[PDB]
Amino acid sequence: MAQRSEIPHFPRTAAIDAYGKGGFYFAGMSHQGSLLFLPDAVWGWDVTKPEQIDRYSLQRVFDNANAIDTLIVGTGADVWIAPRQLREALRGVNVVLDTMQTGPAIRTYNIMIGERRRVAAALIAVPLEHHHHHH
Numbered sequence: 001m002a003q004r005s006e007i008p009h010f011p012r013t014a015a016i017d018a019y020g021k022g023g024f025y026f027a028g029m030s031h032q033g034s035l036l037f038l039p040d041a042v043w044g045w046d047v048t049k050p051e052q053i054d055r056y057s058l059q060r061v062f063d064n065a066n067a068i069d070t071l072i073v074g075t076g077a078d079v080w081i082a083p084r085q086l087r088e089a090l091r092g093v094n095v096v097l098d099t100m101q102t103g104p105a106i107r108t109y110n111i112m113i114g115e116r117r118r119v120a121a122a123l124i125a126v127p128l129e130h131h132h133h134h135h
Contacts, residue, residue, distance in 0.1 A: 020126070033047075034125065037121035040067070053073075068095055070119040073105075079101065106123075
């Protein structure tokens with residue numbers, strides 16, 4: 001419960017800094033895994049690696065999709081293209097889905113965040129441990 005109070009959440013931030021080792025190191029402490037840059041605040045996503053991005057994993061995304069006009073998906077180090085059905089389904093929610101690498105995504109986010117303010121960024125950190133398994 002921390003020190004009798006919740007830790008400060010960054011409510012709508014346009015400044016992303018230090019990407020790489022540790023994930024997204026900005027403001028105080030390293031932020032790794034997957035981050036949901038929402039108009040409300042920068043919240044944490046419960047997805048660890050690519051392909052885990054399923055319709056059920058997008059729970060909190062659809063939940064707040066009313067405030068989401070543009071959805072930037074940062075697949076980290078490699079380009080994972082969202083399946084046609086998933087992409088088309090998001091289109092049906094009127095959500096402009098774009099898949100990009102985190103770097104250019106950071107720039108594009110910084111641009112559109114001031115433009116429309118209706119942009120949400122789902123950025124996943126690079127798998128520096130190269131662990132994706134194999135069968």
